[PDB]
Amino acid sequence: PPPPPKKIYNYLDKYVVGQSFAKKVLSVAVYNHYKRIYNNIIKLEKSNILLLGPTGSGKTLLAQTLAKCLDVPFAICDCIESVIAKLLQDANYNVEKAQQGIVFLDQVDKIGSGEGVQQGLLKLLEGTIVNVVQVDTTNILFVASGAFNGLDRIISRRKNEKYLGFGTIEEKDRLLRHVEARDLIEFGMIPEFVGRLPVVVPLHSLDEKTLVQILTEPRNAVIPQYQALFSMDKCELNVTEDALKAIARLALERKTGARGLRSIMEKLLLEPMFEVPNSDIVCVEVDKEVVEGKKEPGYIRA
Amino acid sequence: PPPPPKKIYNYLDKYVVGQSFAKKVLSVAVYNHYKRIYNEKSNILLLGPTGSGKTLLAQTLAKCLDVPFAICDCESVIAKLLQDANYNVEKAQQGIVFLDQVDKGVQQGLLKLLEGTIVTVQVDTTNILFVASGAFNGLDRIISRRKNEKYLGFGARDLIEFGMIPEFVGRLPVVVPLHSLDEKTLVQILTEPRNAVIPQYQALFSMDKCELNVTEDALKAIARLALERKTGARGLRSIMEKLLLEPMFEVPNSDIVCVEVDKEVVEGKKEPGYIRA
Amino acid sequence: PPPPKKIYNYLDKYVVGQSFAKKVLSVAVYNHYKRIYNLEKSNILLLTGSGKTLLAQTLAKCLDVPFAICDCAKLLQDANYNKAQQGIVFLDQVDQQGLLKLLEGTDTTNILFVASGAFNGLDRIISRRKNEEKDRLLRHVRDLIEFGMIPEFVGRLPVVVPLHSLDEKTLVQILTEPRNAVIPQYQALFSMDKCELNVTEDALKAIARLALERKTGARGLRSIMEKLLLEPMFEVPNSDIVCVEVDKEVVEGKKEPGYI
Amino acid sequence: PPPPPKKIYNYLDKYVVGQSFAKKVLSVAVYNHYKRIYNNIIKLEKSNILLLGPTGSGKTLLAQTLAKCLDVPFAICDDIESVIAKLLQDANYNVEKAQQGIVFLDQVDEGVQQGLLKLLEGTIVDTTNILFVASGAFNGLDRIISRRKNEKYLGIEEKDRLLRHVEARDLIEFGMIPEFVGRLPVVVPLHSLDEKTLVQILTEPRNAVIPQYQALFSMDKCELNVTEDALKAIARLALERKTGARGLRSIMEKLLLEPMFEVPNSDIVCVEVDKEVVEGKKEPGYI
Amino acid sequence: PPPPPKKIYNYLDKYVVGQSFAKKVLSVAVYNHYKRIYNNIIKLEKSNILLLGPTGSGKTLLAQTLAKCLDVPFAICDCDIESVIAKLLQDANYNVEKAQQGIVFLDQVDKIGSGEGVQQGLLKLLEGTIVNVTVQVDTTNILFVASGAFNGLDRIISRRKNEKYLGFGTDIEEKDRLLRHVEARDLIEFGMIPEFVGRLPVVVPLHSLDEKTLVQILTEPRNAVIPQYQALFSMDKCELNVTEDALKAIARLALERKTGARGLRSIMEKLLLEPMFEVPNSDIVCVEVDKEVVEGKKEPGYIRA
Amino acid sequence: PPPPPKKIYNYLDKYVVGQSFAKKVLSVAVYNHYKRIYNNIKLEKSNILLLGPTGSGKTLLAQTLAKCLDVPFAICDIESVIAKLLQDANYNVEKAQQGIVFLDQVDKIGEGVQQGLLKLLEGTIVNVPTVQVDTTNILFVASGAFNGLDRIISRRKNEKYLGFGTIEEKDRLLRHVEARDLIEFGMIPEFVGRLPVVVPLHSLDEKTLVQILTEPRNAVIPQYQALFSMDKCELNVTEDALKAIARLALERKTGARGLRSIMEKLLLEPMFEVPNSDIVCVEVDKEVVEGKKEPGYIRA
């Protein structure tokens, strides 16, 4: 049987901190797609899916995480028939298997108004048969992604919060939570393309606990992978729990998402990484003072 | 023989609820074209909102159309019609071609189809019914700028202006605007058509051993919200999706057997009702 | 080439109001193909709202010369790739200098051109130069350069024609007399089925008046007359009605056609 | 052996009326070219000839007139190779005549000027021997010259008479790139056409307008006849219209409209226009 | 074993003067790039390197010299996007199993500031995607060093560092100091897509050339300017003697050219035009260059055989 | 073996009258290149920028210097530049990579060409559509007018000490072109830096115009004398008349382009009347050039 959304939600919870709304929406949508194929083999029309998440909040990771769980053909592509050619050779020419796949459209929010692809996608987000052999996009489920760089400003205009004079990141979380199709049209999309993608979700921008959580909680969290590199040097990196807070704050201040974590860590680790190679240091300690920059990292020597 | 347009209006009344006063024109034009098949071109253009039946009318008309049909949107489209459908080239000349999104070099080239021409064999395509469609986004603004003046004190021409060539505006001889939907349409659209939105969601929940009841007051509220975004026949889907996400998160394998929706629930004042073993 | 006498007899049947312009077009083209039968051409400018594209296709249907339409190669396709440069090019919306060598040979040296355009304010420019009344002023049409046309472009347009531009009673003739007038076509349409279709002579009077008050030329007669006969076409069929009639106040929206 | 310049002048004299000075300079320019190609087949350089034209002076027809007798491949226009390929097509791709040809460039009056700069000088795209001839109506250059006319700010023949004193200082002041002007060493002003020159233009040229129209009515079983005062009256109105030789054809076509229709079907034997006919006060009295 | 950072820094120091921070970052990174190759054969992922510096002052030289010390294929190109992997695959003798371990150097990335459309195209080769080299090849491991001049990026860091600021608030020294504060928001403010800044984690400021560093550049490193010129004169069998004060004068003159390492050539070229023109067959034994000679107070002295 | 630089100076002096300083820099530039293409088969090239106030040697310097070159040369106004060079060397890649390429009209660029040419100048692989080529050994000689740079440099030299907190000039001032000035003209410092050698060409004087008319090869008056000998007639121009021609060129302020425009005007009537209208010789005195006399004709 199709796995439930609580299996998928337990699975996605193993890689992305929370994002419970996006995790729920992906889960219910995939389940609805799998269930529909059992029946469809009244027509059961698909609903295309939209992710509005900013940089560094895991949109590609959510796709790539779901990708490792999909028992259904899936395609990864980025902003035409080569996309389905991927899916078809993924299938190994089983046309019936591809005709039920799910496609991820990375960086839809980059395309604006080329627009001819937006025009072109109208009749591929909706069903048409297409050659390479013919197969029909009618069931192919689309998941759309991008930062929609301006869209927050459009939402605030649509909310009239930018009004002035007399008249009759938490902020960004609130605004993105109230996206409207009026805004997605205004971000350079054609309204027909906004008219499809009936399900849209914000991904909430990551918070202070989320970043501290990201440093250890996920599989391949940031601290685990650094200390593995030090482990080849026969050294254990250790960081006090209080230093993780300032790192998170500093990377939150970088306004560049979870991948900003490695930049701050790279800077802090810099001196240790050059001095370690053969120097008979056994273990390297990083504390609050190191993160604050007030102290060079403390070295344990044999 | 072509059935009368009021009989054709039977077929379309089964699928698009509120466009009777454009559906009337379409039905008449088809009967004229068929009365033009033997013994002026009925070629046609659909205008107005997305999500309001432009493509559904085309596919529906073909569902009663004995002669083969092609739909396309903006030279091998007839090749699609010819290859799959057409065994008979007079039937292929007798085909119906829908050109949607036309309002989105080709315009000059379509004059060779709008007049019709030879534009294997290169058949005299004059017999083909070129029906056509598109958003024409902004036609109303041009019309508003022409229909009214800034009167002050105390007390086809639009299609050419939209950017279409005068020959092009002249050479699809019939045009219809289609209504923007209203709550009167939407409440019927929710349950009246075959394949309608609320039937499918109940079906989606019936395979999970549930009966979902949605009362008439719920639909009344939902129609209000669904029209606030222009996506029309897709505004139903977006707001039904947004509302029914949580019961669908908790229905599966969950020993729940019914949900009930009310105006407060649509308004967010109450959680979805569940009924359980 | 046939004398202009015969050319007039064909042309006259199709645009009744532009008697003067019919002569200029007919006489020039005969002499032109006479010199070819042996000699510079001279490009033609049509001064529109009155069937310029109708008139252009009229000559084409007469001569079967290469004919093509362009908006300010298709001709060799229109020539069926077969005279090679003796045809007519129609240039619409001429109301510029890059076509001058194209108006010359570029060969192109033989091509007769039919320019057309609504020179809005040429009356005021003629009113400037002079320091149906507006057509009578247009009958008085360097002055054309003063309206704003390129002198070099005007130089290749030495022949210029008013087009009887009011057409305001001849619409009634146009609704009736020409080779395929709209109301005779509708009679062929509805009476292709069993039904009658009388249109009273005072309905034509009001119908022409309607097109003129809307400030629509002969282009919009097929549309507006479609509206009156839409519901008749809708209500005739399925053996309902055979006797049908339209009358002047039905044009006025006051009433529905008769029946049995 | 290239023909002598006097013969080319008399040969070109047949087709364009009056303007000897421009014709004489263009005659020398062609003769010099065929002497240099005969002499470098030192290694003397080209010199391009620029024709300052009031519109309708015949500037284009004159070049065709030289092109007629000289049998040198010739082209005009107003991308860079788009003219040179036209010469290579016209030259029958004759590799030497492509190098030896003559090219017109029209209404030449910043990127376009600067891209042709090393095209006018000999460069390969082979321009090393192409004799460029050019035309331009640099209207107001006389006003630039007028501004140059000894103005001090501290304690119609005259227009031809002023254009007769043109120099490169005004043309840079006109807006031409100096490198382009330097590439155009010979500046020739065409004479403006008086009524006498326009009167000559109906009778003198090989293929003048009246011989053309008189031949069309001659093609019918008819004949076209015109008084000398009638020709003189036509010129007087034509000048008043401020239209050059382009406009003479138009004004003559207005007078002959009714005859052209009436005479066919063997109606009438001759038609005659007088001074009062020219004013439009009377229809021509066919016979 | 992979070469230690110790060796790389010492290897590069013979060719690149100063810039121990720039050398340290590159030294660590290529050693770390070796660690990934042996690990991925817990998953490690790449940190992309960005070098930004005043005009020409070591950026290209560091890359090429560092390129000389790579055991993996490398490719340097100037910012179609296929051309990156096209040249890497070509460069690797089409040995894909070694090519995917490659290091890519990008130049002039600063010039692609918002055009904007090129930034979004390489976002797939940064981080990871397969690339349609024909073959399809995966960029995920490839280590990218983005080099740009970022001319005027100091203008933005100065506006960012409150060196331009609003309200009551209550050159050489500044420029090197200012770039040492560079924030990610400054690359965003330059015109770089916030998406594209985010996947260039490691931002490396290269310091402006001090006057003493110019003195070392004249003689110390490999291919120093004066060694080049005595080779030219020794090919005319003539010697060139430059006093140490003349070095001080030349560097002081070159610092005034605001043109970095290329100014040494211009000042050196201008001085030796006549000697080089006169020596080749005049039996000149040696050429003497003093400080007054550099100052233009003397003609260059000749000693005849 | 390479020719000595002084030999190129004597050779270039035959075709170009003035500007020995420009000749000398190019002379050293060729000879340095010749040593460098042996040595590198390490040494690095210095490209050259020629500043030519309009109508002066720059395009002729390229052409006359080019005829010395055993290696190929290409003078063009972006990979087409490398394409043009490779074609001249008969697709012989080992000889083509050593060439001397002239990039004309560097002042006519905008930013895109400047910053796109950096990799060729500094050396990069480029393929002529393919043949793989390395531009490292291309010698670039660039020519551009840099119009109004004299006023730019003048302001630099005029605004100094001007604030309260403290043709003759064209030739004198333009000897002091500096990197700030080339940058300030609208050149990327990236581009100003990699053309280290800047060679300014002085304006042309009257004493030089007279010499050009007679002394160097293909001089203007001998060409007109040769043209007339082709018609079996001699052209005599006295020495005093040449002085007037140069004076008329100065007020034309079009340099060497203006000489032949002025001279061709005079020789129109001789060239129309002398052909096959038997004349022995024509003498143009100052009176004829002054426009106060018509050319005297010698006849049998």
Ligand SMILES: Nc1ncnc2c1ncn2[C@@H]1O[C@H](COP(=O)(O)OP(=O)(O)O)[C@@H](O)[C@H]1O
């Ligand atoms: N909430 C999160 N938890 C764990 N990792 C995250 C989170 N947000 C972002 N990431 C990291 O973001 C990196 C880049 O992926 P992503 O942010 O999806 O790129 P983009 O958003 O530009 O498509 C991944 O390495 C992933 O580990």
Ligand SMILES: Nc1ncnc2c1ncn2[C@@H]1O[C@H](COP(=O)(O)OP(=O)(O)O)[C@@H](O)[C@H]1O
């Ligand atoms: N009034 C309506 N009643 C029922 N369905 C409708 C109505 N309007 C639009 N639709 C639905 O819209 C969907 C898309 O077709 P349509 O909206 O006609 O195309 P477009 O989006 O190009 O206008 C169809 O599935 C159709 O069922």
Ligand SMILES: Nc1ncnc2c1ncn2[C@@H]1O[C@H](COP(=O)(O)OP(=O)(O)O)[C@@H](O)[C@H]1O
């Ligand atoms: N006398 C006529 N007979 C038949 N059709 C006519 C006549 N006059 C105008 N028309 C029709 O009117 C339309 C032309 O409209 P008009 O505004 O004149 O545009 P155009 O300048 O392109 O002719 C065409 O459909 C043409 O067939």
Ligand SMILES: Nc1ncnc2c1ncn2[C@@H]1O[C@H](COP(=O)(O)OP(=O)(O)O)[C@@H](O)[C@H]1O
């Ligand atoms: N002297 C002349 N002899 C014959 N035809 C002439 C003469 N002068 C002018 N024309 C005619 O009038 C026109 C001359 O103007 P043109 O050279 O076209 O001016 P432009 O080239 O500046 O537009 C040509 O059609 C030419 O035939």
Ligand SMILES: Nc1ncnc2c1ncn2[C@@H]1O[C@H](COP(=O)(O)OP(=O)(O)O)[C@@H](O)[C@H]1O
């Ligand atoms: N510190 C330095 N030591 C030696 N040479 C240097 C130094 N800095 C710059 N250079 C010179 O500058 C060039 C290297 O950088 P460059 O190629 O100018 O960078 P870009 O890619 O910006 O042009 C070489 O000519 C090198 O000799």
Ligand SMILES: Nc1ncnc2c1ncn2[C@@H]1O[C@H](COP(=O)(O)OP(=O)(O)O)[C@@H](O)[C@H]1O
């Ligand atoms: N000093 C000179 N001696 C001889 N000919 C010269 C001299 N200066 C310029 N010329 C002539 O003028 C041209 C060179 O000037 P050019 O480079 O075209 O000016 P610009 O620098 O504006 O491009 C050539 O045709 C050449 O014959």
